[PDB]
Amino acid sequence: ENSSLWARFCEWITSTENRLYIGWFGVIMIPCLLTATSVFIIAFIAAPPVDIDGIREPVSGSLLYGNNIITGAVIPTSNAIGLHFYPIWEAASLDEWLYNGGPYQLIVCHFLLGVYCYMGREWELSFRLGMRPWIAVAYSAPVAAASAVFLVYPIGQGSFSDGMPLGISGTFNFMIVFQAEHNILMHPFHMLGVAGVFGGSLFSAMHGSLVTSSLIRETTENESANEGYRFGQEEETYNIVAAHGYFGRLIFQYASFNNSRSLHFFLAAWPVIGIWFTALGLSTMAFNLNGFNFNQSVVDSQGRVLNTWADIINRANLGMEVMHERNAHNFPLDLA
Amino acid sequence: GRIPLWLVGTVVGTLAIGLLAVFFYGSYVGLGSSL
Amino acid sequence: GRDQETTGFAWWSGNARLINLSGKLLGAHVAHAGLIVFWAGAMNLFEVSHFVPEKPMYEQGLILLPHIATLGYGVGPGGEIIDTFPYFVSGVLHLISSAVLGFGGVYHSLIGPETLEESYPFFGYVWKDKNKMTNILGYHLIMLGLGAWLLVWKAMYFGGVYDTWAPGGGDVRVITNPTTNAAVIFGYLVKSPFGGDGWICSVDNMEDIIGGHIWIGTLEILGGIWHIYTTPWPWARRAFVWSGEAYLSYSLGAIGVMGFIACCMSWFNNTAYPSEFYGPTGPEASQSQAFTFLVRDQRLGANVASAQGPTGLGKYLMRSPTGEIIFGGETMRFWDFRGPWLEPLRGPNGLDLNKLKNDIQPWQERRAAEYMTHAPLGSLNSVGGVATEINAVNFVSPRSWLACSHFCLGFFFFIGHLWHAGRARAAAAGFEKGIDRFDEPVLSMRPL
Amino acid sequence: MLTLKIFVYTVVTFFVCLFIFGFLSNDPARNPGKN
Amino acid sequence: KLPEAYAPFAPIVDVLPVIPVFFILLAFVWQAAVSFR
Amino acid sequence: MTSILQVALLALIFVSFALVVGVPVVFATPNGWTDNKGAVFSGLSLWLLLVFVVGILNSFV
Amino acid sequence: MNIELALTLVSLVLVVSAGPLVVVLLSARGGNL
Amino acid sequence: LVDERMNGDGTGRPFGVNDPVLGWVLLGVFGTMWAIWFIGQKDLGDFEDADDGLKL
Amino acid sequence: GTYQEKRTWFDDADDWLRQDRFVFVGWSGLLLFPCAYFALGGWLTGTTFVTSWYTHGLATSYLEGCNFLTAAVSTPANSMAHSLLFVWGPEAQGDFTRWCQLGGLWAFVALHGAFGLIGFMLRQFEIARSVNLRPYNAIAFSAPIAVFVSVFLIYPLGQSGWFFAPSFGVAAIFRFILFFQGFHNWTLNPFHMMGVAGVLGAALLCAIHGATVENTLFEDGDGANTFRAFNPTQAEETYSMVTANRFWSQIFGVAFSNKRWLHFFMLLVPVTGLWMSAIGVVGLALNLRAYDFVSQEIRAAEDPEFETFYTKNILLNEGIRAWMAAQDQPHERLVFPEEVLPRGNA
Numbered sequence A: 001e002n003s004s005l006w007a008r009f010c011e012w013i014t015s016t017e018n019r020l021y022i023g024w025f026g027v028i029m030i031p032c033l034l035t036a037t038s039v040f041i042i043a044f045i046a047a048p049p050v051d052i053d054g055i056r057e058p059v060s061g062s063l064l065y066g067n068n069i070i071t072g073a074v075i076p077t078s079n080a081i082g083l084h085f086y087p088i089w090e091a092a093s094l095d096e097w098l099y100n101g102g103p104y105q106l107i108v109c110h111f112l113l114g115v116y117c118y119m120g121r122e123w124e125l126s127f128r129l130g131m132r133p134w135i136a137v138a139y140s141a142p143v144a145a146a147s148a149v150f151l152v153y154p155i156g157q158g159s160f161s162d163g164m165p166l167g168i169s170g171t172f173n174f175m176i177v178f179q180a181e182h183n184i185l186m187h188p189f190h191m192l193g194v195a196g197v198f199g200g201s202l203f204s205a206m207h208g209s210l211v212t213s214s215l216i217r218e219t220t221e222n223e224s225a226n227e228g229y230r231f232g233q234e235e236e237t238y239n240i241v242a243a244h245g246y247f248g249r250l251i252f253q254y255a256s257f258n259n260s261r262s263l264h265f266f267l268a269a270w271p272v273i274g275i276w277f278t279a280l281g282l283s284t285m286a287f288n289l290n291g292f293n294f295n296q297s298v299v300d301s302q303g304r305v306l307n308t309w310a311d312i313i314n315r316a317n318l319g320m321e322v323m324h325e326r327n328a329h330n331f332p333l334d335l336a
Numbered sequence B: 001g002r003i004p005l006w007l008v009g010t011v012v013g014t015l016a017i018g019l020l021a022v023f024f025y026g027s028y029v030g031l032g033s034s035l
Numbered sequence C: 001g002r003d004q005e006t007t008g009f010a011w012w013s014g015n016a017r018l019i020n021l022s023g024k025l026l027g028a029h030v031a032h033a034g035l036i037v038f039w040a041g042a043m044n045l046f047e048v049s050h051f052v053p054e055k056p057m058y059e060q061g062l063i064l065l066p067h068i069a070t071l072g073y074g075v076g077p078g079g080e081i082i083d084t085f086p087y088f089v090s091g092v093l094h095l096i097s098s099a100v101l102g103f104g105g106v107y108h109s110l111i112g113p114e115t116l117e118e119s120y121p122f123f124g125y126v127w128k129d130k131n132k133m134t135n136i137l138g139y140h141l142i143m144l145g146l147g148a149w150l151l152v153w154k155a156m157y158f159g160g161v162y163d164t165w166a167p168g169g170g171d172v173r174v175i176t177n178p179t180t181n182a183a184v185i186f187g188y189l190v191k192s193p194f195g196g197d198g199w200i201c202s203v204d205n206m207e208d209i210i211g212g213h214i215w216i217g218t219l220e221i222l223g224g225i226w227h228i229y230t231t232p233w234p235w236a237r238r239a240f241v242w243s244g245e246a247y248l249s250y251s252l253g254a255i256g257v258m259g260f261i262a263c264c265m266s267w268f269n270n271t272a273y274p275s276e277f278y279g280p281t282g283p284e285a286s287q288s289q290a291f292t293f294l295v296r297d298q299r300l301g302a303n304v305a306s307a308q309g310p311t312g313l314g315k316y317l318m319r320s321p322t323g324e325i326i327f328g329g330e331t332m333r334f335w336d337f338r339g340p341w342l343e344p345l346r347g348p349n350g351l352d353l354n355k356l357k358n359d360i361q362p363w364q365e366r367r368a369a370e371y372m373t374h375a376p377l378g379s380l381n382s383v384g385g386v387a388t389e390i391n392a393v394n395f396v397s398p399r400s401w402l403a404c405s406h407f408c409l410g411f412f413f414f415i416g417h418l419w420h421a422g423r424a425r426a427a428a429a430g431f432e433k434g435i436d437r438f439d440e441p442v443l444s445m446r447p448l
Numbered sequence D: 001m002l003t004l005k006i007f008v009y010t011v012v013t014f015f016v017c018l019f020i021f022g023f024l025s026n027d028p029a030r031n032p033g034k035n
Numbered sequence E: 001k002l003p004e005a006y007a008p009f010a011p012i013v014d015v016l017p018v019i020p021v022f023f024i025l026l027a028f029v030w031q032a033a034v035s036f037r
Numbered sequence F: 001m002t003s004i005l006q007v008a009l010l011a012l013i014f015v016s017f018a019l020v021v022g023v024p025v026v027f028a029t030p031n032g033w034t035d036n037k038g039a040v041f042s043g044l045s046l047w048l049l050l051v052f053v054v055g056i057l058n059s060f061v
Numbered sequence G: 001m002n003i004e005l006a007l008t009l010v011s012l013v014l015v016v017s018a019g020p021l022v023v024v025l026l027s028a029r030g031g032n033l
Numbered sequence H: 001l002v003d004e005r006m007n008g009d010g011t012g013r014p015f016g017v018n019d020p021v022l023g024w025v026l027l028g029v030f031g032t033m034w035a036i037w038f039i040g041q042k043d044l045g046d047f048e049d050a051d052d053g054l055k056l
Numbered sequence I: 001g002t003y004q005e006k007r008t009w010f011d012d013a014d015d016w017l018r019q020d021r022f023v024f025v026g027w028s029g030l031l032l033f034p035c036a037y038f039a040l041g042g043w044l045t046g047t048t049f050v051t052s053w054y055t056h057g058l059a060t061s062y063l064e065g066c067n068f069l070t071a072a073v074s075t076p077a078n079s080m081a082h083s084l085l086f087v088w089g090p091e092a093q094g095d096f097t098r099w100c101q102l103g104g105l106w107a108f109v110a111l112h113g114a115f116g117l118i119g120f121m122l123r124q125f126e127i128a129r130s131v132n133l134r135p136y137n138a139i140a141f142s143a144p145i146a147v148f149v150s151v152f153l154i155y156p157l158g159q160s161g162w163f164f165a166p167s168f169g170v171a172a173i174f175r176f177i178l179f180f181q182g183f184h185n186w187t188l189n190p191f192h193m194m195g196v197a198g199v200l201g202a203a204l205l206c207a208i209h210g211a212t213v214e215n216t217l218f219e220d221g222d223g224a225n226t227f228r229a230f231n232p233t234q235a236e237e238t239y240s241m242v243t244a245n246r247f248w249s250q251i252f253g254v255a256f257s258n259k260r261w262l263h264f265f266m267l268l269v270p271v272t273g274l275w276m277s278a279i280g281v282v283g284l285a286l287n288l289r290a291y292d293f294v295s296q297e298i299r300a301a302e303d304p305e306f307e308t309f310y311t312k313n314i315l316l317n318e319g320i321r322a323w324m325a326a327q328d329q330p331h332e333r334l335v336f337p338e339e340v341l342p343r344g345n346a
């Protein structure tokens, strides 16, 4: 028509008729995730071993170097680099990039930029369909959690080596070293997040049971119960008064939601608020505000010290403090 | 009823948050005070 | 007050009832502006009341006094304290003045006219009136531009501020020559934020910190007049949402980013947050360890250059990946540090071997021995060691309170951004209430 | 490596400018709502 | 510490920081007084 | 002039505790502002009186 | 038991009492809150 | 000088540019995307008006 | 029924038991209510007054200075190791105040908790049959029972004592968790790796379905408080399953299309997770743990250049075992020179 080249282009990005919606976050999400995906696969398979700690003992992380799926990892950037922006072109040779912890910092910068914008297009499509916009808020609870383990925690420590590796056994070392230095289990933000998922799983097992247990009889018994629902129907597929009536007898009548719109808000609000504190937990633990510490706290008269369980957890932490980075510490404090 | 409910919960809710402050006060003094 | 059946807003989303009520809303901000000043006065007098002026200021759990002390009130050379009467005045000044804001917050919220539109025409505003918003914007740019000049005038005429880079321990200095070069000032903004560059935390002298405020003082007065005499252009009409909640969420996107910067500046910058007052930084306390434990070999006489470590790297001094003479161990990650107790020990090629073995002042080790002990890593009940440290001392740095609080405060405002900027975009379109159930769009689209 | 650094700057500032000049192009009227 | 003409008022000033927390608690008291209309 | 100041400053807290309590009661009563209009002006000005009175003799102490 | 710790807690009773006292005096006398 | 490299990580050069071809790359790509947007502004509505946004 | 049989005393008792009331008693209430009440009441008694100084050798009560985090009803000592510690039995012999001192108040809570959990699951059966529903709420609660029975009962009945059970306290769990990392390497058991995916996967379905419903609602009121617009007896649904399908179909790629299958999928993901983690604890009760990979312990034995994070984890498990087991297992009477425990340097 009389439309420009640009208007032809903007009526394609914001077109909802596409199989996967792009939108304007997706024009910079899609080339960042396909960057970060395609480099994650290669370094998980063919990365040469990385000096993680700067002491020139390279750690293996590739499947081609005698690892399996569980011990495979993408090894973090070396301790000598620290927080210096280390792209591919600052290295002289390409193998100097790989040995120093190259593809960790390439992935994380494209990953975190990708998931900030995957949250963006969850808003953007919801504006293109007339939906209410707050699904993008609920995706910020993992985005707050993933920003902390990759970016907010290496800032407070000063190096990308202390961030979390991209591996299954790589994660498990990061959980151990963290609690040895910061005692995460004795921090009320990790206590909220633990209740965020034990409550979150309970509120899914309980809600999903009662909707299944109040289904209306529409099929036979040889046919599955999922055939009673036909897609896009108007009438309700389960009795709601019967499930409040059941759950009202179960504990007491005031302990239930009869308003199903107030119910589904509670299912959204409980884990999302819970993950927000355990995302802010290690965000504050990144700036060295560890947790509780009740060592040598219960004492009697005559100046003696009684053990508690907190002194037992001390012995676990003290056994891991003196073992992580085994050839690094030249000095009797772990300030770094 | 006789007494309004709103100053029932205020008096009880003050004496509950007044009660919690003792247990924080008792955390730095007395037993378990680490001294 | 009001009710739910006339506005459709419950008791908990109740402050949203006074969107279209101009006058009540004015009392709502004034009353809240009282509480900020009231917290400023009360917490200042509280911290003066528990202040021992012979111990260091950062040891006693203090955050508002080093803000006043950075300006140079009652302080002398090396970070000492002369008199604590000016710290008493500002706590008194804010606390009395909060009641003046307190009366205006009570008055307009109760008895003053709830819509000041047709009675007071200069103050009345409709949220779609774009010329009126750019006025109310442009007035406050002056009030926030003039406030930048007060720091400039106090650093150039009224005694000056605490310059921690002065020779022989920092003290109060009148900054006579502010660096106002635009290439020098705007070099910080378009600098990368990664290590060694440090976007705006790496401003290292007092010559620039007040040097920059001459720009932002001038621009916010030049920009404030610009928005008074102009309306937004038709591309800005094609770009923004022009409601009441939309103006809020624009702000919440801004001060979410403000929190993350003050989160980082109080953790890294020992120039605007001097280490004599706020305590040492994390990178400063770690580099203080290897320096003081290099004095602890000079008393024994072993060669710090030839001290090879267990991995063959150098126990005390090693080489940077850009080729500079730095410290060694696990503190190699902090080699980007600069500090006034250590910068008189560096030459061209980093720190000099011949200078470190001979040219150590006695006060430099004395300051670098407090900074080994008072490292900022602590606990939550204020124990103050590593997590494997028993209940002995009672210290955790104000840098660790400011970086943790202003991260979380500056985080939820970004969640505050994504709430309101979605809702204001939805409610301007029409479907904030839900799907229509009669003419809805998804039933009018093609499949897949 | 300079040949690679001049290529990333062409790539990034292409997609960054599709972003900035994309939201300016009357995105708040690209909605299914009616008035 | 406080000045010496002001030192008998140290017990009052150790309450003053907690006051703004009591304003958000007042707003729930007032909404219970109107019984959440 | 210490005890002159301390009696004047105990007097301030008694007036402020009146003005913290009574002044919202004056506003939120029906027609309470048209009745006690000059009454509050006495209590407000006496607050403004004492704050300079306490403020001036700090130079003498 | 100090004279300082006591008068501090006397000071806290008066302020906490002053909160709902504004609510009580308008729930009885005026009725406009 | 075993190897040749950038030597540009701790330098603080503005926008990371060190060769002036990068500034023309930063600016020339920007002006081209602006030029296509400015031409195609004819289709995006003409809000030369008193108040014509997505108001409420 | 339908032949006029007479009424017996048992029939008369049933009507009182299955009478509607503010709290439902039923027949299962005779098993539930006196067994559940003594469990938590026996927990609050033990955490408050009852020591642990004779069993483990460490204080555990509020009457000793332990706070809410560090108070625990502790397990018995490893002397008994499998006795039920009856208050009349030979380890106690009637004396109550010496019965608590041997840690026997642990077994009072664990055993009265088990018959509580049987009774509470029976509670969900007879309420469902009264209201004539389907039993799927009862079937989901078996997965908390399988976690309880395996961890607190099958695991000490396979190990050497009730000593190695978890103690009913907050920080006492925190060593039991840290027991399983060093001594078992429990993070590499795939039965726990399928437990995590059940927990974190069900937390994700609680957050999406609660937000997809809440953002695809139908405009039925006019106040913006959208909770007001729900008459719960209405025949139509409250949100748009068509729109919610097309959102995640273009955001994510595949989405639900079946409201019956969806809530059943929210049933299946947490239940399979715990049931696939109750199997892993059974292997730990026999110490059939997935501690090692053979082909990497060999390669790290002959070469001091090869390592992974796996070999870095085996050293950290040695740091938990060789350090805390001096105080954790006091019945083993073992002492350590400070040279026999592994360290790094400085």
Ligand SMILES: CCCCCCCCCCCCCCCCCC(=O)OC[C@H](CO[C@@H]1O[C@H](CO[C@H]2O[C@H](CO)[C@H](O)[C@H](O)[C@H]2O)[C@H](O)[C@H](O)[C@H]1O)OC(=O)CCCCCCCCCCCCCCCCC
Residues within 6 Å of the ligand: C235, D024, H014, H015, H017, H023, H026, H027, H028, H030, H031, H032, H034, H035, H038, H041, H042, H043, H044, H045, H046, H047
């Ligand atoms: C080390 C250093 C590295 C440096 C790197 C460089 C970084 C540069 C950062 C710049 C960041 C700015 C980004 C925001 C720009 C916003 C532009 C805008 O909102 O723009 C909105 C406005 C809209 O303008 C209006 O557009 C209107 C369009 O009308 C048309 O459309 C109307 C309806 O749409 C009617 O139909 C009407 O009939 C029809 O004519 C009219 O033309 C008006 O007269 C006109 O005022 O545009 C304008 O004013 C734009 C005014 C400013 C333009 C700036 C251009 C700068 C170019 C620099 C040199 C580049 C060289 C390029 C070479 C290319 C080849 C190699």
Ligand code: CLA
Residues within 6 Å of the ligand: C001, C002, C003, C010, C011, C012, C013, C014, C015, C017, C018, C021, C024, C025, C027, C028, C029, C031, C032, C099, C102, C103, C106, C109, C110, E023, E024, E027, E028, E030, E031, F019, F020, F021, F023, F024, F028, G022, G023, G026, G032, G033
């Ligand atoms: C600091 C926070 C703040 C502020 C300034 C306001 C302010 C306001 N709110 Mg909001 N509100 C808040 C928090 C806040 N609110 C919170 C946290 C909630 C959730 C509980 C609400 C929920 C809410 C609802 C549901 C409603 C309001 C309404 C109002 C307005 C009128 C209230 C009224 O009629 O007074 C009458 C109240 C009283 C007479 C009680 C006494 C109040 C006095 C002022 C306290 C005095 C304090 C202090 C001691 C005075 C010192 C003296 C001074 C002179 C020195 C007012 C502008 C109403 C509205 O929509 O207005 C149109 C309304 O319906 N608010």
Ligand code: CLA
Residues within 6 Å of the ligand: C137, C141, C186, C187, C189, C190, C219, C220, C222, C223, C224, C226, C227, C230, C231, C232, C233, C236, H014
């Ligand atoms: C915080 C205060 C504030 C606020 C809220 C606003 C808000 C607004 N301004 Mg105002 N303005 C302000 C301060 C403020 N301004 C100041 C201080 C100045 C003086 C410089 C101006 C000058 C100004 C002009 C001249 C115009 C506005 C316009 C606008 C409107 C649209 C802005 C826009 O599209 O941004 C979106 C942001 C962008 C499109 C990109 C901006 C990024 C800039 C260019 C920063 C890059 C600078 C960089 C660091 C320098 C590189 C140096 C290097 C070469 C070494 C909006 C209502 C416009 C308007 O509507 O007219 C009334 C308009 O024409 N403002």
Ligand code: CLA
Residues within 6 Å of the ligand: I030, I031, I034, I035, I084, I085, I086, I087, I088, I107, I108, I111, I112, I115
């Ligand atoms: C119905 C609820 C219920 C259930 C299931 C249990 C179950 C249990 N309790 Mg708890 N208890 C209950 C109620 C219950 N109790 C109440 C109400 C009290 C308060 C008084 C207690 C107080 C209590 C204490 C203080 C203790 C227990 C203990 C026990 C355990 C030992 C069981 C045992 O030896 O009984 C054996 C008896 C039976 C199983 C009854 C069987 C019926 C017989 C076979 C009928 C034949 C009778 C016939 C006349 C006998 C003739 C003998 C003749 C030759 C002389 C077991 C887990 C002990 C424990 O926890 O272990 C550490 C313990 O110390 N309970």
Ligand SMILES: CC1=C(/C=C/C(C)=C/C=C/C(C)=C/C=C/C=C(C)/C=C/C=C(C)/C=C/C2=C(C)CCCC2(C)C)C(C)(C)CCC1
Residues within 6 Å of the ligand: C027, C028, C031, C032, C034, C035, C038, C045, C092, C095, C096, C098, C099, C101, C102, C103, C105, C106, C109, E009, E012, E013, E023, E026, E027, E030, F009, F012, F013, F016, F020
């Ligand atoms: C609207 C409203 C609201 C709010 C309100 C407010 C917020 C208010 C504020 C107010 C304020 C904000 C006030 C303030 C006040 C203050 C004052 C009143 C002060 C005083 C002071 C003094 C008295 C001092 C004294 C002294 C001195 C002189 C010095 C030292 C010593 C002493 C301390 C003694 C609410 C929420 C409720 C809701 C409803 C309505």
Ligand SMILES: CC1=C(/C=C/C(C)=C/C=C/C(C)=C/C=C/C=C(C)/C=C/C=C(C)/C=C/C2=C(C)CCCC2(C)C)C(C)(C)CCC1
Residues within 6 Å of the ligand: C185, C186, C188, C189, C200, C203, C208, C209, C211, C212, C213, C215, C216, C239, D019, D020, D021, D023, D024
């Ligand atoms: C004082 C100081 C200083 C200085 C400072 C300064 C000078 C600053 C400035 C600053 C500035 C000057 C800034 C700016 C910024 C900007 C921005 C931040 C922008 C933003 C943008 C936006 C936000 C946009 C958006 C959009 C898009 C994207 C598209 C469409 C739509 C819209 C439009 C919305 C110094 C450093 C020297 C020193 C220190 C201190």
Ligand SMILES: CC1=C(/C=C/C(C)=C/C=C/C(C)=C/C=C/C=C(C)/C=C/C=C(C)/C=C/C2=C(C)CCCC2(C)C)C(C)(C)CCC1
Residues within 6 Å of the ligand: B006, B009, B010, B013, B014, B017, E019, E022, E023, E025, E026, E028, E029, E032, F013, F016, F017, F018, F020, G015, G016, G018, G019, G020
């Ligand atoms: C400056 C000053 C002053 C003033 C002060 C003030 C201004 C105060 C205020 C105060 C206040 C104003 C307070 C308030 C209070 C209140 C409260 C403390 C309440 C509480 C409550 C509760 C805690 C509860 C709640 C609840 C309810 C009721 C319902 C819902 C649920 C619950 C239960 C949560 C004076 C003059 C004295 C003098 C000195 C200085």
Ligand SMILES: CC1=C(/C=C/C(C)=C/C=C/C(C)=C/C=C/C=C(C)/C=C/C=C(C)/C=C/C2=C(C)CCCC2(C)C)C(C)(C)CCC1
Residues within 6 Å of the ligand: B016, B019, B020, I037, I038, I040, I041, I042, I044, I045
């Ligand atoms: C062993 C025994 C037994 C039993 C006994 C019992 C059963 C008891 C019970 C007991 C009980 C039944 C107890 C209860 C308790 C409770 C408590 C002790 C509580 C506490 C709490 C607290 C401390 C807190 C509170 C709160 C909360 C919750 C939060 C917020 C705040 C408040 C404060 C409100 C029998 C006889 C079988 C045999 C003999 C011996």
Ligand code: OEX
Residues within 6 Å of the ligand: A157, A161, A162, A177, A181, A324, A325, A328, A334, A335, A336, C330
């Ligand atoms: O990097 Mn991964 O973990 Ca933060 O502490 Mn020192 O450095 Mn290392 O050791 Mn401990």
Ligand SMILES: [Cl-]
Residues within 6 Å of the ligand: A328, A329, A330, A331, C328, C329, C330, C331
């Ligand atoms: Cl080290």
Ligand SMILES: [Fe+2]
Residues within 6 Å of the ligand: A207, A211, A264, I209, I263
């Ligand atoms: Fe549901």
